[PDB]
Amino acid sequence: HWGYGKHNGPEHWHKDFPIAKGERQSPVDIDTHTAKYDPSLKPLSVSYDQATSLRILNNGHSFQVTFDDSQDKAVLKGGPLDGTYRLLQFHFHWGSLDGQGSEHTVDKKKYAAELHLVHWNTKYGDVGKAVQQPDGLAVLGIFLKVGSAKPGLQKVVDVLDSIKTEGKSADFTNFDPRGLLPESLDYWTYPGSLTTPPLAECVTWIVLKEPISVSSEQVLKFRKLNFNGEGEPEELMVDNWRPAQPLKNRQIKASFK
Ligand SMILES: COc1cc(C[n+]2ccc3cc(OS(N)(=O)=O)ccc3c2)cc(OC)c1OC
Ligand SMILES: [Zn+2]
Numbered sequence: 001h002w003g004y005g006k007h008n009g010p011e012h013w014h015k016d017f018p019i020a021k022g023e024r025q026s027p028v029d030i031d032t033h034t035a036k037y038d039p040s041l042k043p044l045s046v047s048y049d050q051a052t053s054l055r056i057l058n059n060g061h062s063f064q065v066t067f068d069d070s071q072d073k074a075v076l077k078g079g080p081l082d083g084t085y086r087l088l089q090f091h092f093h094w095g096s097l098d099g100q101g102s103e104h105t106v107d108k109k110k111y112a113a114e115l116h117l118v119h120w121n122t123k124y125g126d127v128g129k130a131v132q133q134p135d136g137l138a139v140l141g142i143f144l145k146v147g148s149a150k151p152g153l154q155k156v157v158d159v160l161d162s163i164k165t166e167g168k169s170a171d172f173t174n175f176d177p178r179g180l181l182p183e184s185l186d187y188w189t190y191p192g193s194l195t196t197p198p199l200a201e202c203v204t205w206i207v208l209k210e211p212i213s214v215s216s217e218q219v220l221k222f223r224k225l226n227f228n229g230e231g232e233p234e235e236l237m238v239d240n241w242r243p244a245q246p247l248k249n250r251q252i253k254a255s256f257k
Helices: 010-016 151-163 216-222
Strands: 044-047 053-058 063-067 075-078 085-094 113-121 137-146 169-171 187-192 203-208 212-214
Touching (some): 053 151, 085 137, 085 216, 137 216, 151 216
Parallel strands (some): 137 212
Antiparallel strands (some): 053 063, 063 085, 075 085, 187 203
C-alpha cells in the first residue's frame, strides 16, 4: 500500500495510479517571475462563519479535521471559481526538519508545512462525483513557516496526543477554521490534481502568497504522530509531502501584481 517510505513513496505511486505521470499533476514549483498577473481574477470569498467541525482523525498518512458538508455552511466562492464549493476537511503536510515539508514551493523555497482546506463543487451533489470532474474540487493551500505561535492552531495541537496512531479519531467540535488564515488573501492559481492517491486531476489549486507563522513547539507536535497503527513498530509521521511535478502545458496565474 502506498505511503511516503523508500519502498512505497511518491516515486512508486505511478505503478498503482498511472495518472501520477499525467498532464496536470500537483504540487508544482511556483516561479514568481513567470506567473502571470490576471486582473480578471476576482477576490476570494471565504465564508466560514457557520462552519461545523465534526471529528479529527489519523488516517495513516496525515491527520484531518472533517466538517459537516450537508448544507452550504462553510463555502468558498469567487477567485477563479464558478459556483459554490463546500468545505469538507482540512489536513497538513509537514517535514522532519523546518526546511522542508510543504508540497508547493515558491521559487524553489520549501516551507515547514502546508495546510490544505479541501472544498467540493456543489453542482456535482457529492464529493465522490466531484473527484471525477475537471472542476470538481478547490483546495486552498496555506504555507507555514516557523516563528511566532499561531494561537488559533493550538486547539488542534493539544488534541494530537489522542490520535497518535493510524485509525484513531476523536470528537472535535466548535473549531473555527478562520483562525488559520493569513491577513491577505492574495493568491496564485493553477489547474492541478490531488497530491495523494488516487491523484485525480480534478482540483483548482488556490495557493496563498502570505504564510502563517507557527511556533517550533507547535510544529514538533505534528512530528510525534505515527504512520503505524497501535501495537506496530513505531514510525514517525514526517515528510508526508509529494515533490513538485512538471508544470507541462499550464500557466500559473496571480491575483496580484
Ligand atoms: C469525505 O471524504 C471523501 C473523500 C473522497 C476523495 N478525496 C477527497 C479529497 C482528497 C484530498 C486529498 O488531499 S490533497 N493533498 O490533494 O488536498 C487527497 C485525497 C482526497 C480524496 C471520496 C469520498 O467518497 C465519496 C469521501 O467520502 C468519505
Ligand atoms: Zn494535502
